[PDB]
Amino acid sequence: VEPVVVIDGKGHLVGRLASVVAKQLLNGQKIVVVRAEELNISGEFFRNKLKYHDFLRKATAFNKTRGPFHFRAPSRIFYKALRGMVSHKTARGKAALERLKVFEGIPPPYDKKKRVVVPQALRVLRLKPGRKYTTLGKLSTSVGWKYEDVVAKLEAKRKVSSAEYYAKKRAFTKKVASANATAAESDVAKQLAALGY
Amino acid sequence: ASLPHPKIVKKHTKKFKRHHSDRYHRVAENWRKQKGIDSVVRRRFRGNISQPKIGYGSNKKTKFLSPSGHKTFLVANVKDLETLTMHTKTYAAEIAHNISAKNRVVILARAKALGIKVTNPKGRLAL
Amino acid sequence: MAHFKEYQVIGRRLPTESVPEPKLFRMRIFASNEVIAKSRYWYFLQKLHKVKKASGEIVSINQINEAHPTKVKNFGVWVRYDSRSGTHNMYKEIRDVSRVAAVETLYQDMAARHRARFRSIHILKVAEIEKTADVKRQYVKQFLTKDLKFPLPHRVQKSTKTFSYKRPSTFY
Amino acid sequence: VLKKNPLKNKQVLLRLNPYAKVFAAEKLGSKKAEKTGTKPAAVFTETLKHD
Amino acid sequence: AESHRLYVKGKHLSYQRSKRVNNPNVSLIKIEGVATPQDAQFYLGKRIAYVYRASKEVRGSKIRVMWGKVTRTHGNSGVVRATFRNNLPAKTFGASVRIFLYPSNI
Amino acid sequence: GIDHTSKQHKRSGHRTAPKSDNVYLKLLVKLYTFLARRTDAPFNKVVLKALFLSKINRPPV
Amino acid sequence: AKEIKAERVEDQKVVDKALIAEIKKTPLLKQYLSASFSLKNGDKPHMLKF
RNA sequence: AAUUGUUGAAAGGGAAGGGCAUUUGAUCAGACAUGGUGUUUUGUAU
RNA sequence: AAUACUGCCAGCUGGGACUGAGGACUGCGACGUAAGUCAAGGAUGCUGGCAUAAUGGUUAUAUGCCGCCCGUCUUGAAACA
RNA sequence: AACUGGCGAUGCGGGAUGAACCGAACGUAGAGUUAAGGUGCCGGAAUACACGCUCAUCAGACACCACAAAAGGUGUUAGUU
RNA sequence: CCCUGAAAAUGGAUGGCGCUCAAGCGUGUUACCUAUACUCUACCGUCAGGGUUGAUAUGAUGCCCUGACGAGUAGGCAGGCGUGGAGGUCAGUGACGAAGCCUAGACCGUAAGGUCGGGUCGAACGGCCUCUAGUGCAGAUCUUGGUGGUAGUAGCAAAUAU
RNA sequence: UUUGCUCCACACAAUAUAGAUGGAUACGAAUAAGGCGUCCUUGUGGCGUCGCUGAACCAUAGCAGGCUAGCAACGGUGCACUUGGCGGAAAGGCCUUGGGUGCUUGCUGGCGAAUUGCAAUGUCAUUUUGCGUGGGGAUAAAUCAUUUGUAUACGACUUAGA
């Protein structure tokens, strides 16, 4: 329904988000994944760290420079997770991975555009309450991502920049809803409502 | 034109080229069955060339028929073309390659006189 | 095959000139249809009496429907099974609405807990608990409390589209 | 030349089975039944409902 | 108006395929917001046009088109099998075909 | 697939026409084929089948 | 390489005369007919009915 | 012919080549444009 | 008493897809008092555009999937035979 | 070594892969329905439904098959006396 | 069920990614996906059973009807294509161009192959019926000849020296 | 280097398409909780409401969108201008003063539409150059060759030279 969608990565499980995103990428959809810091992996944090180290110590023996490039940024973690879910080697897979753009935090111009969430990939709707979870923000800092603090400050600034945006949007929405009430209970709206709206 | 005929369909238009005929130059394009004990072309593996079979045999009612709906006929002399006087709807004339230019003009003149379509009328045109 | 029906299967030895009219045994079988009813009848009858389907005959197969199929009632199900390293018997309380649903839930829960398939479960007896104050399982006595009340926190709503524009809540 | 299917194509369904027209006219496949006030034995229903 | 779409869009998903064999003769189309087979039953028989742009004018238009029809539903997700006079180029996996409302039924 | 109860495409194992090239024998067969086709008498059905026999199977009488 | 008949036009006139006269009574229908039809987004023709 | 040059065409992210199908480009034959339900031969076969 | 379940209809009907095989008639049958008509031993009717590179063919390329290097010896070959 | 079925001599769908296993054996095409196997994505197919069990600081994931035992655990869920 | 027991050497394998009221385990309900399988149809081939001659069909190993089948190495048989040469015929073709050769140009045949168009060339060569054989090549560390990559590379550095 | 280069305008052609055909419509945090509105003895507050899907909200009528007239009014919405700003995470976009201008379907009129003939996407987008029409803007470097050695097999590196 949408030309390009911006997926908020907050509160999503890595695998269940990545699967639906990989399907939508192949179907010809354009998706930009933001807030990859808060992307969640189900289960114990230390277990996830050990799993990552299992992967991490696994490199081309004769020349480490060409082995599996163990990316540390949360965006590249999620993007590697989405690879493998896409036949990346072929040209169609290459096109899909071109149609994918993963971003730490919310860079412009996706900062001023509507973000979307995948309801059935969510931690809230997929993890039974009580089962603890692992978040890429701390996992990546534990594995080598050396930019959490600056990402933290940039998001601190983006929260206030968007907070004033909503502060004025709420006021305008309130005044337009109040004007809707003012112009309501007239014939044009009264019989429109019974007409269906 | 010819008599009405069923719709033409080859059922295999692509030629059946011999295996490895491009990988090697000595292997001619003419089809030869791969008769080896290892050969995946003989064992009919998926994703390999399909050998000619009788199942590809064209419809009998449309065999030897050109798209124009005629059976070809090598005509060499005018007397040969006099054979197809009343069978213009079945056999189409065709000048043999070794017919000289001066002898092709007379044959095409008799061809239009007899009303037989010729499938190489622009051959060895004298100009 | 878990969608069940109770059938009463009545059957007997082949009548003979020496002894006619055999005793005409009968039992209540939980089965997906009449064919599995016949099969389970002969199985549970071989394990009881010297008779085989070749040497016997089935006189009737009547579906049994509940007297109050929409009334909650507690069931004590004596059930035996064959575990990996021997057999067992036990007695499971179930709180369902019909004997059919009780045995359905029972096979499903036995396969879930003790990993016992149908081929290794024999329902000895499903007796409706006539009154309370005798069920010995806390997981049923907790639903026999007065003013049985409990909420349902964290409702998950199934979605229709891959994309939702509201960050769904979960109140309920 | 071509195997037309009965059970449809009423023309063939009448070429075979001439009784088909009477069957369709008098609805022999959808025949109403009578009513009988027969009650099963109390002993038999007690056997069914017991235990 | 500013919207002249008289068709419903559709993503040409892929060829009718097995795990490792595809049949180019049959394509698989997905309609937006159609996710159930009874809903996609309406779209059967509808015409599908794959409208693509050619590098050159051929018969008075730079815009070429491959025609097809919706054959049958596919899966439980409202995906529909489609068939064209000439099969889709296998490069258009994820391209926008147009499903018109004719032949109309309602 | 089909369980071939017996060998498939098993030819009759009999002669349909003489293997010989004799035009007059072919004419006799052309005639008795017409007779065996158009007469109930089995005498034609047997003389026709005997006209195909080889030299060893047609001993002098 | 490459006007309308003077007989079609008067039949058109006399027929849409009656159609217009019929249509004037019911509200909004004439400009409803003038408006073209199109498919918006967020529309589902498989359940939309006309 | 192998092989080579020049020119022209195209393709080339650790091969090339092949099959199925289509796109795209290049190129290629066919129709039906039939003595034709006839319609005055300009001192009667267009 | 219904309704659910199972089953039946030589019940009706809506929509979709692929195929049109053969080429005088015969036959079987249905409806019509009959004449004849017909969904009855296989597609006809109307209409439209184009009449050519439009369809199609070949070839090159791209794409989706598949595709191991042939001959032989061998129970077994893509083989590091 | 015995009975049978297969591979050899055999492709095809599934077992990621494989001569033997499961399904099923093959003229060329079309349409439908399926088998084995599956239905998050790669990947065609329900992130379908239902009941439970399990949290592993080396989970488990499907026959042939590609690994695991004795013993032990107020870890937890059922149960018997 | 899980945990301990549970340690092998390149990095790495439920196939991978990932998966935690699972995308795990046990179990069940349906729906759905797809084999060259099954059903129907068309076509090809083989086989089998048949139809076809009182002035009617090119005059019959022919035409047609019906039905079923079609995997396959070793191997068997049948029908054909092609090369060299012989007998016959087409009163065949040809210096206005035979043969030969090239042709991501065309047609026919399932195929072996045939035919046609274009370019070179310059003197013989075809179809059919039959006969005959030194008759068909991708292999034989095959023979002879030629030509490549390697490769403008190794090398042309003993003997003092221009 | 046939007045070169580049940018703003317009045109013309190609080639170019991983795929426009109303609007990416912007809080954050939690989910055993939240959003909104009011209120107050401003706080982790009171009250009320909402959710249970985006199936929403906006927009959406007109020769593919003409011509024209009026009515109610000070709105909406392009187009540019301009006031100011704010935005560096890949800012390149958002807000806003004001006036001009086009449209206005908010309401009522009138005229036109045809023959593309019963469908043939019936073309309308976004990229990149290249010849051009006319305005602005500026008027170099690098490589070889020579040479130094902080360098070096050759390249490279580091130099120097009007």
Automatic annotation (TrEMBL), chain C:
Highest taxon of source: Eukaryota
GO (cellular component) term, any one: large ribosomal subunit
Residue ranges of domain Large ribosomal subunit protein eL20 in the record: 5-127
Gene3D superfamilies: 3.10.20.10
Subunit note: Component of the large ribosomal subunit (LSU). Mature yeast ribosomes consist of a small (40S) and a large (60S) subunit. The 40S small subunit contains 1 molecule of ribosomal RNA (18S rRNA) and 33 different proteins (encoded by 57 genes). The large 60S subunit contains 3 rRNA molecules (25S, 5.8S and 5S rRNA) and 46 different proteins (encoded by 81 genes). eL20 forms multiple interactions with RNA and proteins in the central protuberance, connecting components of core functional centers that are located far apart.
Annotated PANTHER family: 60S RIBOSOMAL PROTEIN L18A (PTHR10052)
HAMAP family for this protein: Ribosomal_eL20
The protein, known as: 60S ribosomal protein L20
Organism whose genome encodes this protein: Saccharomyces cerevisiae (strain RM11-1a) (Baker's yeast)
